[PDB]
Amino acid sequence: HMNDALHIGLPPFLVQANNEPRVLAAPEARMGYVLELVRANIAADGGPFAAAVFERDSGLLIAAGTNRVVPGRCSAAHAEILALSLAQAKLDTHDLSADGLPACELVTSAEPCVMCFGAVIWSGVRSLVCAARSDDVEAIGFDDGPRPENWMGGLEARGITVTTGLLRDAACALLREYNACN
Amino acid sequence: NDALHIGLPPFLVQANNEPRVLAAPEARMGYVLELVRANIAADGGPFAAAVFERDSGLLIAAGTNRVVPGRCSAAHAEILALSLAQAKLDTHDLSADGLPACELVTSAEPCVMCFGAVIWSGVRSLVCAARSDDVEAIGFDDGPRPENWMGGLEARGITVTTGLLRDAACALLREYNACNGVIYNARC
Numbered sequence A: 001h002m003n004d005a006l007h008i009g010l011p012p013f014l015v016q017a018n019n020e021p022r023v024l025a026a027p028e029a030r031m032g033y034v035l036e037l038v039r040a041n042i043a044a045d046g047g048p049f050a051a052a053v054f055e056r057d058s059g060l061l062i063a064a065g066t067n068r069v070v071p072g073r074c075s076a077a078h079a080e081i082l083a084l085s086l087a088q089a090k091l092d093t094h095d096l097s098a099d100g101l102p103a104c105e106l107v108t109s110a111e112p113c114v115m116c117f118g119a120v121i122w123s124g125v126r127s128l129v130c131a132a133r134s135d136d137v138e139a140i141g142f143d144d145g146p147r148p149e150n151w152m153g154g155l156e157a158r159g160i161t162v163t164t165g166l167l168r169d170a171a172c173a174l175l176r177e178y179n180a181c182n
Numbered sequence B: 001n002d003a004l005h006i007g008l009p010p011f012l013v014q015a016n017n018e019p020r021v022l023a024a025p026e027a028r029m030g031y032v033l034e035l036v037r038a039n040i041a042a043d044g045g046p047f048a049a050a051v052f053e054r055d056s057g058l059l060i061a062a063g064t065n066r067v068v069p070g071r072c073s074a075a076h077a078e079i080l081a082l083s084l085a086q087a088k089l090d091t092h093d094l095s096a097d098g099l100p101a102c103e104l105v106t107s108a109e110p111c112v113m114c115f116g117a118v119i120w121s122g123v124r125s126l127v128c129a130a131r132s133d134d135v136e137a138i139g140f141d142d143g144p145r146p147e148n149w150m151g152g153l154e155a156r157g158i159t160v161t162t163g164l165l166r167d168a169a170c171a172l173l174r175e176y177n178a179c180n181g182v183i184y185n186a187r188c
């Protein structure tokens, strides 16, 4: 709580993720790093979800986010919202497709909820890469909410390419561990 | 570099600091539309929202669109109002045990992002002024909201009212389009 701002603090691992230079060229290298943030997040009292904004072609890491809903007292503090918002703050624009910016990609541990679906559309990212599916997320009692018919087509029609199931099995291993062992 | 930090302009800090009780829907929405006009004057978009105690009218928090000045595409009025209400009441869930029922009063029907945010927030009531068609007829974009989003909220025990002070909300959207241009116009 602050008089004069909405302020979501980041746990140490996530401050480090957002300030340590990191270039990950391969799609699986990007998603592997996002899954490292999942496990660090769970250890830091957060939900089993992480995402990062990368420059699409180089794989330069711009920003990372994790679920901070409960410790942050903020239902909007999904991984995707934090990653997109922190990337925008770093690049000084609400619009990651502004002229001069390199094309940006959101790499996410799970397919977005209806709120984060909207956030992706507003953000200016040109690519979304997901590991776990809505079905995998719903099957451990998280709720994607009423996502419109053909949410993938909705993103694709707006110039946002969608890839799903990348390291899904590894993402499912961490989700199942969260369900059992947490 | 260690936080998501969305700064609030002074008028919005003022709005979040002063105790205020507005019983009637029209009183609540009247105050939300004052914040629309103040926000336009502070380089923001023509959108504002506030969380109230549904049954007492006590204001809990207000938000405005700070997308462009705040360099944050998530900084929609609804996201700021719901999040600031959560920070103030110290919970992610505005329906947590012991909290009064909360109401989001918004200058326009929520985009698909904000629709999802309303579902997760714990508010039990949504009250809107401008319709989605009003906002999209004047060049804005609410994005692909699911079929019967109002039915979707009502089925989750979130009551929906729309069109409240729609005429004043439309007047602000139209006055904003007029002055929304690079050529200096001292009238603005």
Ligand SMILES: Nc1nc(O)c2[nH]nnc2n1
Binding pocket: A047, A049, A050, A066, A067, A069, A077, A078, A079, A080, A110, A111, A112, A113, A137, A142, A143, A144
């Ligand atoms: N569906 C879903 N649910 C949550 O609680 C989340 N947190 N971060 N991304 C998220 N996605």
Ligand SMILES: [Zn+2]
Binding pocket: A078, A079, A080, A112, A113, A114, A115, A116, A117
């Ligand atoms: Zn989400």
Ligand SMILES: [Zn+2]
Binding pocket: B076, B078, B110, B111, B112, B113, B114, B115
């Ligand atoms: Zn919105």
